[PDB]
Amino acid sequence: EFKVDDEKCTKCGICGNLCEAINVLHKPFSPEIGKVEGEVIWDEAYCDGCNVCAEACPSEAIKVT
Amino acid sequence: VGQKKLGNVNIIDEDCCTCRWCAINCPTEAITVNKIFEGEITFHAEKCPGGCSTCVDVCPANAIYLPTPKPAKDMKGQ
Amino acid sequence: EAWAWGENCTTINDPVPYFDITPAEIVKGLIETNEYLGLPHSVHIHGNNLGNPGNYKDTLDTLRLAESYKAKNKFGREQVLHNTHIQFHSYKGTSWADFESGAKEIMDYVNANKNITCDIGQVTLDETTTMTADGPFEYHLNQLNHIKWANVDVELETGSGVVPYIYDKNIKVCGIQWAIGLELALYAKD
Amino acid sequence: AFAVHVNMERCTGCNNCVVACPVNALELNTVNPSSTDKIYKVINGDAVILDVKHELCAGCGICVDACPYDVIQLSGQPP
Ligand code: SF4
Ligand code: SF4
Ligand code: SF4
Ligand code: SF4
Ligand code: SF4
Ligand code: SF4
Ligand SMILES: [Zn+2]
């Protein structure tokens, strides 16, 4: 079902702030990289076919089914 | 219907230190901050006596880092 | 030393972590040092890829490192390096089910070269503890047989490993291991 | 140029205030050492501060954070 495109994701919380399934962990910010980088974790136990977060993402980084 | 943008976000202008972590990392390039000072700072790494991360601890804009040690089979003599 | 980080030098060419020197370079440097000082005994050498099938090729690769030296000393010795327990280095094949003996090739090379002297590591087919100064072989053996394992890393110098092992008669692997040393000794012209 | 005070009564000689001071670590652990003077040295089992005239300390707190049983008080005010 769910699939993110880490190629086009900026790790903006506006995708994990909506659903209770999407929890976005920003691993600690270090000037090493100087960038934001984390992971998007989706759990089945909370989803729906709502698909709101597909278009809530600023980018098109989320396709769900 | 188009766009959502619920709410409003600002920057407490008497607290920003012009580090630019938020402008460099903003997704939509919507933040305009300009550094108050200009110049250059250099670090002679070969003169740090190791376990003294006081500079790292006190940097306000967390510009400083301890460069992460590479794993084995990746050090490549450096 | 790569074991001190948890890796192993599986061939003669791969570099050491952070040192970018290779087994070949270090063996050659120690041979030059030894024959220059004229020490009594030569560079006694263990080798690489110990205890795995197909490592007779690597054994020949490491034995070809002496082709350009001559034993100079006031003592009588014709070796320049001494390759030890060679029945351990003379395996052949891919795994333990397609595993046979490369003693013929090893002793052909030794019967050719007169600056290489050897010894056999004949297995006596009983219960024993195996102690070699290299870690990776002992760790690999422990992961094979699930028995005790002791590791003693030294500071800036070596490693260690102690692992019991059963060379019992009821295994094809142990039988072939027994046969290999006899083939080595009985193929010796000198 | 601050002032450090070591409570000799509960100092155990652990030597983790000597090893951890970044001014002590200048001599042996720097490329082309600049200054080779040392704040602490454990003489007779307790840490003695050779920096009598308070010229080399930098208020880092690596030594206060290092001592296992807090015994080093760092003074941030002029002596
Ligand atoms: S899915 Fe969209 S909103 Fe969520 S982290 Fe990725 S880019 Fe940001
Ligand atoms: S599809 Fe709907 S329910 Fe599922 S994660 Fe996205 S917003 Fe949440
Ligand atoms: S990240 Fe830096 S520049 Fe941006 S608001 Fe915060 S202090 Fe100011
Ligand atoms: S604070 Fe940083 S730069 Fe200063 S001595 Fe310690 S490690 Fe070196
Ligand atoms: S505060 Fe820092 S510089 Fe001063 S004595 Fe302690 S460790 Fe040394
Ligand atoms: S670290 Fe503390 S206990 Fe140890 S020598 Fe220094 S002052 Fe004494
Ligand atoms: Zn050996």
Strand-pair category, A38-42 with C81-83 = unpaired
Q: Are C122 and C178 in contact (CB under 8 A)?
A: yes
Kindly state the helix (H) or strand (E) to which residue D6 belongs, with its residue range. Answer: strand D3-6
Place of tokens 């010894």: C119
Around Cβ C107, how many Cβ atoms within 10 Å? Answer: 20
Cβ contacts (< 8 Å) between B73 and chain C: which residues? Answer: 2, 5, 7, 17
State the Cα–Cα distance between residues A8 and C95, nearest whole angstrom.
Answer: 45
**Residue ranges of the alpha helices (H) in C22-167?**
23-37, 56-63, 86-89, 103-112, 135-145
Which amino acid is residue C128, in one-letter code? T
Residues facing residue C163 across a β-bridge: C130
Which amino acid is residue D46, in one-letter code? D
- Smallest CA-to-CA distance from A3 within A35, A37, A47 is with A47
Q: Are C28 and C81 in contact (CB under 8 A)?
A: no
The DSSP call for residue B40 is -
Provide the shortest C-alpha distance from residue B45 to chain D (in Å).
9
State the Cα–Cα distance between residues D4 and B45, nearest whole angstrom.
Answer: 27
CA dihedral for B24, B26, B30, B33, sign (positive or negative): negative
Q: Do the Cβ atoms of A32 and B65 come within 8 Å?
A: yes
What is the phi/psi pair of residue C127, to 5°?
-90, 135
- Smallest CA-to-CA distance from C152 within C166, C138, C142, C165 is with C138
Q: For ligand 7, a single-atom ion, which residues have Cβ within 5 Å? A: C 46, 132
Place of tokens 């300009």: B34
Q: Binding site for [4Fe-4S] cluster: residue ranges of B?
A: 16, 19, 22, 26, 48, 52, 55, 59
Q: Are D24 and D40 in contact (CB under 8 A)?
A: yes
Cα angle B74, C1, C7 (rounded to 5 degrees) comes to 55
- Smallest CA-to-CA distance from C118 within C127, C131, C109 is with C109
- Smallest CA-to-CA distance from D41 within D24, D26, D29 is with D24
Around Cβ C100, how many Cβ atoms within 10 Å? Answer: 13
| Chains in contact with D via at least 3 Cβ–Cβ pairs below 8 Å | B
State the Cα–Cα distance between residues C43 and C35, nearest whole angstrom.
Answer: 9
Residues facing residue C118 across a β-bridge: C83
What is the phi/psi pair of residue C162, to 5°?
-125, 125
Resolution of this entry in Å? 3.0
Using CA atoms, how far residue C172 sits from B18, B75, C144, in Å, is 73, 42, 15
What is the phi/psi pair of residue D49, to 5°?
-90, 110
Chain C residues with a Cβ under 8 Å from any Cβ in chain B: 2, 5-7, 17-20
Q: Do chains C and B touch (3 or more CB pairs under 8 A)?
A: yes
Q: Which two tokens stand for residue C109?
A: 């090379």
Q: Do the Cβ atoms of B48 and D30 come within 8 Å?
A: yes
